């Protein structure tokens, strides 16, 4: 957060007028254990050129894993989400989105790589900045107070509406910090739910058990308040409802394993395609998966039930593939799913 302040002008007013929750949202992200992040500032009107460059700019930064739009306007968020090409999310990138409604779920280009949360969160005080921080105000005051008064009325008009309707912050920014905090404490295989939110005032709308059950089938993760625990995240499901990609930890664990292995294989892309190469490749992946299994990331009593790697002349490839330069490796992982429901069966035996 200190680094962000030294490089960006923290405030609730966009450069000149518009209202922005980005500065406040980033404060919540660091408050909830978030680590280093990347900022993609948008300047001037929302041109079509910016949309086309979004997948390109993200790919250049090699470490980016999660995509978040901390804006509050629903129309602005929809444009950003659609701008994400299917080839971007399918390459190992996870998107965190905010639902605009309790009843219907979001429409996403890649459902399996998206998590949706509801409702938004409230904070008591926003970040107010002096005139020297707002880009075009101190210079404008000394030059022409007449237009300065004109701008201030709109600024004051923005200020009281936010106070009246309450300080509503999109929740995706908060959840991104929870993802990093969970990954630091437990593994990526641990579901990011059942974690207490920090530095919050209230949720936008209270939910009941019956209401959440309606959304949980649709794939909308809920923010619930429990008296014994406080405000917690209650839900770990993506937007896809099949057996494979249903829970967030299962999908994100594969993204990590694929990206890590793919990065390691870049030093093998021209090695000889013979038996000695296959033995080294198999051992490297086997050791990596064995380490994951011992950390509890894979389900099984013995390694044969948790993971398997297959690479060989007649088990995975053939003579024609070798002649054409193809090297094929088969990797199987049995990820661990969260226990979304605990069922206690009491008998009098």
């Amino acid at each position: 957060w200190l680094d962000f302040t030294n490089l960006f002008n923290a405030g609730c007013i966009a450069p000149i007028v518009n209202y922005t929750t980005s500065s406040d949202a980033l404060k919540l992200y660091f408050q909830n254990g978030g680590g280093p992040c990347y900022i993609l500032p948008q300047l001037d009107r929302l041109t079509q050129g910016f949309l086309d460059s979004i997948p390109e700019l993200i790919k250049q930064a090699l470490e980016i894993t999660l995509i978040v739009c901390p804006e509050w306007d629903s129309g602005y968020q929809s444009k950003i989400y659609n701008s994400l090409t299917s080839s971007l999310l399918n390459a190992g990138y996870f998107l965190i989105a905010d639902n605009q409604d309790k009843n219907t779920a979001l429409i996403t280009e890649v459902a399996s790589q998206t998590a949706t949360y509801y409702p938004a969160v409230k904070v008591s005080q926003l970040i107010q900045a002096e005139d020297s921080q707002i880009a075009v105000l101190a210079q404008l005051k000394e030059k022409n107070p007449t237009v300065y008064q004109q701008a201030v009325q709109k600024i004051q008009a923005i200020q009281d509406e936010i106070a009246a309707n309450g300080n509503i912050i999109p929740v995706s920014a908060v959840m991104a910090g929870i993802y990093c905090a969970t990954d630091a404490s437990r593994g990526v295989w641990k579901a990011p739910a059942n974690i207490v939110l920090s530095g919050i005032s209230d949720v936008a709308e209270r939910l009941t058990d019956d209401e959440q059950g309606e959304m949980n089938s649709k794939g909308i993760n809920a923010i619930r308040y429990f008296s014994h625990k406080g405000f917690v995240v209650w839900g770990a499901r993506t937007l896809q409802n099949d057996d494979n990609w249903r829970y967030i930890p299962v999908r994100r664990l594969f993204n990590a394993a694929e990206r890590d292995i793919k990065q390691a294989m870049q030093s093998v892309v021209f090695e000889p395609n013979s038996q000695p190469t296959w033995e080294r490749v198999k051992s490297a992946i086997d050791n990596y998966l064995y380490s994951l299994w011992q950390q509890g990331a894979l389900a099984g009593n013995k390694p044969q039930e948790a993971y398997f790697v297959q690479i060989g002349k007649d088990v995975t490839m053939s003579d024609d593939d070798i002649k054409q330069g193809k090297m094929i490796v088969k990797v199987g992982m049995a990820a661990v799913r969260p226990a979304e429901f605990i069922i206690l069966q009491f008998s009098q035996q």
């Binding site: 920090s198 530095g199 050791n287």
Partner: protein
């Protein structure tokens, strides 16, 4: 040992950096007399406090409201200063007394929560910093705040209630009301020196306290067996004023952080281990280095065990240290260049 820092408005303006005080004479040398936080500083020293720090947000006259105090506490420069100054351990904000309790509305309840969160944010600048917190005057609001508080930093927060009145008087003959945070902080320093960190600062007598500002019977609902309980300052028949309670803000009953001594003892162990580990930052990662690290750590832990700091009859249940090519890491870890040390502990229960 716990070196508290005092944050508040001071009549004599000073710079934005803290000062080092070892006696009231040094306090008088830098500061003028008369003021709420000066009275508590005197109370801390008179109870047996040795040394402490003082940090000033501004002058005494520029007190505005509760939100102004919280906003002033959220400035960036305070976090950097306590982070830079290594030996600060406890955070005290006695200036919360100067604000009245007009109503029990949601406006007042939320403000108390933000002050707790803001202080806990200051406690996260460095690891091992404990925050001493206050509670609203009536038990109704305090119980409401305790149940509704939601934060992941509950482990580092300790709250004391109610306010205390002392023999100190202003020019008008009125008893000065002081927060119990100053009094306990001196006790921790005395407990740290005489008895050590692993001794709970409860069931101990305070000094120069006339009576708690409120009574006993109204405080029955604040203590809670499972979690989110308070610590009571309670007068006794024929035993003087006593500190009754050593529980933090931790909610889960199974957590080992539910007691202030256990949280501080582990952090005290952590500080030495980090200090010892700095000497091994670029040592060769072979058997000789592991034996050297194991021997030094085992000897120091054995020394701590023989003082009653650890729960155990033999050494094995008291503690355990693992470091080697096996049982602590793999061959791939050595090539990665990282050394992994696993330490198991067994804390006491008050």
């Amino acid at each position: 040992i716990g070196i508290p820092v005092f944050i508040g408005y001071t009549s004599s303006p000073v710079d934005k950096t803290a000062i080092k005080l070892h006696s009231l004479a040094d306090f008088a040398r830098s500061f003028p007399e008369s003021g709420l936080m000066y009275y508590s500083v005197r109370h801390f020293f008179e109870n047996g406090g040795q040394q402490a720090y003082v940090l000033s947000l501004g002058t005494e006259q520029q007190l505005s409201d509760f939100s102004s105090l919280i906003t002033a506490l959220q400035q960036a420069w305070l976090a950097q200063t306590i982070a830079a100054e290594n030996d600060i351990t406890l955070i005290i904000t006695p200036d919360v007394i100067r604000f009245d309790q007009t109503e029990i509305s949601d406006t007042q309840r939320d403000l108390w929560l933000q002050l707790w969160q803001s202080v806990l944010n200051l406690c996260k600048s460095r690891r091992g910093i404990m925050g001493l917190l206050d509670a609203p005057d009536d038990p109704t609001l305090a119980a409401k705040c305790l149940q509704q508080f939601s934060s992941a930093d509950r482990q580092w927060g300790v709250v004391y209630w109610p306010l205390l009145k002392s023999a100190y008087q202003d020019n008008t003959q009125n008893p000065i009301v002081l927060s119990p945070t100053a009094a306990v902080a001196a006790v921790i320093q005395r407990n740290d020196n005489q008895q050590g960190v692993w001794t709970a600062p409860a069931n101990i007598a305070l000094s120069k306290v006339i009576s708690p500002v409120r009574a006993y019977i109204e405080a029955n609902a604040l203590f809670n067996p499972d979690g989110t309980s308070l610590n009571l300052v309670r007068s006794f028949p024929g035993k003087g004023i006593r500190i009754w309670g050593c529980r933090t803000l931790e909610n889960t009953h199974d957590s080992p952080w539910s007691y202030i001594q256990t949280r501080r003892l582990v952090s005290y162990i952590e500080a030495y281990m980090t200090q010892l580990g700095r000497a091994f930052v670029f040592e060769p990662n072979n058997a000789i280095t592991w034996m050297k690290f194991k021997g030094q750590a085992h000897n120091w832990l054995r020394q701590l065990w023989l003082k009653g700091g650890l729960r155990g009859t033999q050494e094995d249940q008291a503690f355990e240290v693992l470091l080697g090519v096996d049982e602590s890491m793999r061959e791939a870890d050595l090539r990665a260049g990282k050394m992994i040390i696993k330490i198991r502990l067994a804390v006491l229960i008050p």
